[PDB]
Amino acid sequence: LVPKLTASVTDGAVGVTVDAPVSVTAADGVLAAVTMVNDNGRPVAGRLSPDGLRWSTTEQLGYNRRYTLNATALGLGGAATRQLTFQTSSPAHLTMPYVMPGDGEVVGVGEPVAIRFDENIADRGAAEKAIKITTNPPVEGAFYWLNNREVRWRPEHFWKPGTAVDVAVNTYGVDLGEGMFGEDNVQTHFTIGDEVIATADDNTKILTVRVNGEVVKSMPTSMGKDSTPTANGIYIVGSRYKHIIMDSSTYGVPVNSPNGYRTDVDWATQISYSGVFVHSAPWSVGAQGHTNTSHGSLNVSPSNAQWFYDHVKRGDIVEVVNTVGGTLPGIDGLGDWNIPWDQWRAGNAK
């Protein structure tokens, strides 16, 4: 038999994607040698399999390049040689993905996996396909887009403590639509810690922190007044700040408008992108536990706000009930759990 040469590309091909290696395989024989150079004549690092039947590139291939593949094979019935030249995808634009939570972080039972692209994603399906989530113990999850750039992944219910999550965003070489290609791959890993659920009950005006079902702290709170009430629902703990200036204009409300404000506060834990914080409020200690006086944030005592900062972590849960407000939007950025699972699972890749 004369040996036969097969490749993962064809001669004269254009738009060869670089999300996978280029490979050459031999049948009815073995590969004697395979070489690959780019348009500037430099070799491409590759490796021949021990059995001599498969050759594959071992380094990242580049965008908008011309490669020349040269392969020679040997069999009982003579030798076979081929040359192939192909062109890789030429993006119109590159987009870089940013993953949360951080690599090695320990986060609460509510933490969603977040892939924030820095461009609009025309082909949401292609993005979802390039993201591999792995969980141990394995638990079901699904993708849902909060806007044109950020997509989230979470299970039907809060994470189980101790679960290990692994995220591979393999977008390099992936055509994300309208000439948009991934700039790089990202790989992160995080672990779920203790179940921390804090319930802010407007009927008692108390914020109770439960760790694995055990009450560990009770905090009088003053939430948003009737005109600017705190919305009910599930809040995900975001960032923690030793101190921060709360600026209403960050959310589109001028500081000097009737509902505006600019307040430097201590021990601030963000629980919504709309501007809700758990923070120190020494001015409302008397009101805490009795009357709502804020623009929506959970006012608590300095010591309690500091305790919250020191003992609550990213991804923990704050649940607000019995307020005169509505329900936190599901696409706030930290309100993922207010979206019904059936709607989340269905997704919105379009």
């Binding site: 634009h93 987009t95 820095d118 461009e119 609009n120």
Partner: peptide, 4 residues
């Protein structure tokens, strides 16, 4: 322009 449309990055950020």
């Amino acid at each position: 322009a449309x990055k950020x």
